[PDB]
C-alpha cells in the first residue's frame, strides 16, 4: 500500500503534466504551416520547439529538479528533451491511424509528412514501432507521467555532476512506479520491466536523432530553418 | 547622353531587383501567421528574415559585389540590410492606405500591426514619414534600384576594409544615377539631392532600429522568437 509521500509525488507529477500538455492543440496554428522533401521542416521544427518548452515547464515541476544546479538542469534537458517529446507524443498517437492526431486535419501527422523534415526511415521506422509498442502497453496516466520523470531524471547522461543526487531522485521515482503497478494496475506483473525496456528503446532513438541532426546542422540552408531554442538544446555547444 | 557601360549597370540592377522582389507576395503564407503587444513579432520576424534573403540575392548581383572579400560582403550586409528592407518596402507602401499592401487582407500592414513587434513609435513614426516622403518622390524603378545599390555599397560602414574599392563602386553608381536623372527624368533637377537626403534618413532609422533591437535581444523570451538569420545579421557578433 502506497504511502502519502509517494502519493504526493504522483499528484504533483500528474498536475505538472496537465499544465504542460494542451489537449486542444490550439497553439499549432501559430507554427509555420505544414506543406505536403524538406517541405515539413519549418512546421515540424516549430512543433518540436514548442514541445521543448512544454518539457522545460514539466521538468521545472518535478520534485527536486528545481533544486539541482542550473548546470545539472541544462545537462539533463539537453540529453533527454528529444526522448520526452517522443514519449509525451504517445497520447496523440493512434494505433488505427498509425498517425499522431493533433486536432484538425492539417495536424494529422502520417508517416509521409514526418519523413519530409530532413530525417530518414532509419529514425522514423523505429520511432513508429516504438509508438505502437508503447500504445499497446495501455499505461495509466500516472505510469506514463512517472516514466517521463524517470527518463528526464537519469544520472547516466552526459554532463551531469551531482550523479548521486540525481540517482536518488530517480530511485524514489522508480519505487513509486513499481509500487503503483503492483497495487493499482491489474495484471501488471511484467509492466515495470517493459517500461524500463522502452527507456532503452529511447536511448537508441536519441542516438539516431543526434546523428541525423548533425547532418542537418552542418547544412546552413537547413539549420537556418530551425528555431533558436532547437539550436541551443540540440547543439553541441 | 548615357554610355553603354552605364547602360549595362542599369540593366543588371533592374534584372537583379526583378529576380528578388516577388510582386505576388505568395511566400507570405509560409510565415508564422499574424496576430492582431508582441502578437506580431513571430510574423514580422519571419517577414524580415525572408527580406534579408532577398537582399543577399540582390547584393550578389550588383556588379563588383561578388568580387569583394567575403568579409567586406558580410560587413556591408550587416550594416545595410535593415536600410535596404525599408527602402525596397516602398514599392508596397501606399499613400492612400498609409500601409504596406502585400497581397491579401492578412498582409495589409497598418501602423497598428507594426507596433506589435517590440519596437516603438520612436522607430515607427520616422519610418512611416520616410515612406511617404520617398513615395512622393515618384522614382523611376531605375532610380529606386540605383539607390538600393548605392546604399548597400557605402564604404563608411563599420567593418569595411577595402574602403577605396567600395568607394569606387559606389562613385560609379552615383554617376549613373545623376546622369539618368538629368537625361531621363523630367523636372528632376533637385531629385539627386533629395535621394541622398533619404540615404541620411536611412542612417538615422538604422541607429534607432539597432538601439531597440538591442533591447529585444537582451530578453531571451523575445529573441527566442526571432530566426537564425536575423540573429546572425543583426547580431553584434
Amino acid at each position: 500500500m502506497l504511502s502519502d509521500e509517494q502519493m504526493q509525488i504522483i499528484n504533483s507529477l500528474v498536475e505538472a503534466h496537465h499544465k504542460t500538455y494542451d489537449d486542444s492543440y490550439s497553439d499549432f496554428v501559430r507554427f509555420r504551416p505544414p506543406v505536403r522533401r524538406l517541405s515539413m521542416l519549418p512546421h515540424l521544427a516549430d512543433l518540436v520547439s514548442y514541445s521543448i518548452q512544454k518539457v522545460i515547464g514539466f521538468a521545472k515541476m518535478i520534485p527536486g529538479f528545481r533544486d539541482l544546479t542550473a548546470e545539472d538542469q541544462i545537462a539533463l534537458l539537453k540529453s533527454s528533451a528529444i526522448e520526452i517529446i517522443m514519449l509525451r507524443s504517445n497520447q496523440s498517437f493512434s494505433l488505427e491511424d498509425m498517425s499522431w492526431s493533433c486536432g484538425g486535419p492539417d495536424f494529422k501527422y502520417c508517416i509521409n509528412d514526418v519523413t519530409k523534415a530532413g530525417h530518414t526511415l532509419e529514425l522514423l521506422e523505429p520511432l513508429v514501432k516504438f509508438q505502437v509498442g508503447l500504445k499497446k502497453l495501455k499505461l495509466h496516466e500516472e505510469e506514463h507521467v512517472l516514466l517521463m520523470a524517470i527518463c528526464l531524471l537519469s544520472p547516466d547522461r552526459p554532463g551531469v555532476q551531482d550523479h548521486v543526487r540525481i540517482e536518488a531522485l530517480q530511485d524514489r521515482l522508480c519505487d513509486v512506479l513499481q509500487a503503483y503497478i503492483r497495487i493499482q494496475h491489474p495484471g501488471g506483473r511484467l509492466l515495470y520491466a517493459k517500461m524500463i525496456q522502452k527507456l532503452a528503446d529511447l536511448r537508441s532513438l536519441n542516438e539516431e536523432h543526434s546523428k541525423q541532426y548533425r547532418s542537418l546542422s552542418f547544412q546552413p540552408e537547413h539549420s537556418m530553418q530551425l528555431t533558436p531554442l532547437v539550436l541551443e538544446v540540440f547543439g553541441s555547444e | 547622353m548615357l554610355s553603354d557601360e552605364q547602360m549595362q549597370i542599369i540593366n543588371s540592377l533592374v534584372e537583379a531587383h526583378h529576380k528578388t522582389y516577388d510582386d505576388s507576395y505568395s511566400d507570405f503564407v509560409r510565415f508564422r501567421p499574424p496576430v492582431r503587444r508582441l502578437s506580431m513579432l513571430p510574423h514580422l520576424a519571419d517577414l524580415v528574415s525572408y527580406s534579408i534573403q532577398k537582399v543577399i540575392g540582390f547584393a550578389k548581383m550588383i556588379p563588383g559585389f561578388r568580387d569583394l572579400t567575403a568579409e567586406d560582403q558580410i560587413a556591408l550586409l550587416k550594416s545595410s540590410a535593415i536600410e535596404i528592407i525599408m527602402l525596397r518596402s516602398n514599392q508596397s507602401f501606399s499613400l492612400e492606405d498609409m500601409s504596406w499592401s502585400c497581397g491579401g487582407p492578412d498582409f495589409k500592414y497598418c501602423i497598428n500591426d507594426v507596433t506589435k513587434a517590440g519596437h516603438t513609435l520612436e522607430l515607427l513614426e520616422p519610418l512611416v514619414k520616410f515612406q511617404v516622403g520617398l513615395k512622393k518622390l515618384k522614382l523611376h524603378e531605375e532610380e529606386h534600384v540605383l539607390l538600393m545599390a548605392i546604399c548597400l555599397l557605402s564604404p563608411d560602414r563599420p567593418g569595411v576594409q577595402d574602403h577605396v574599392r567600395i568607394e569606387a563602386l559606389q562613385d560609379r553608381l552615383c554617376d549613373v544615377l545623376q546622369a539618368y536623372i538629368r537625361i531621363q527624368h523630367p523636372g528632376g533637377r533637385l531629385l539627386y539631392a533629395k535621394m541622398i537626403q533619404k540615404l541620411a534618413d536611412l542612417r538615422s532609422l538604422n541607429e534607432e532600429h539597432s538601439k531597440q533591437y538591442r533591447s529585444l535581444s537582451f530578453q531571451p523570451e523575445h529573441s527566442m522568437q526571432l530566426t537564425p538569420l536575423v540573429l546572425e545579421v543583426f547580431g553584434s557578433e
Binding site: Q53, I56, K60, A70, Q73, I74, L77, K78, P228, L229, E232, V233, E237 | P220, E221, S223, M224
Partner: peptide, 10 residues
C-alpha cells in the same frame, strides 16, 4: 551559453 535555457529555467 544556453541563454534561452537559463531564462526558461527562471
Amino acid at each position: 551559453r544556453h541563454k534561452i535555457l537559463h531564462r526558461l529555467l527562471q
